[PDB]
């Protein structure tokens, strides 16, 4: 998974 700001 991805968590945060892109």
């Amino acid at each position: 998974s991805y968590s945060g700001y892109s």
Side-chain angles (χ1 to χ4, degrees):
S1 287
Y2 192 103
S3 63
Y5 178 104
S6 70

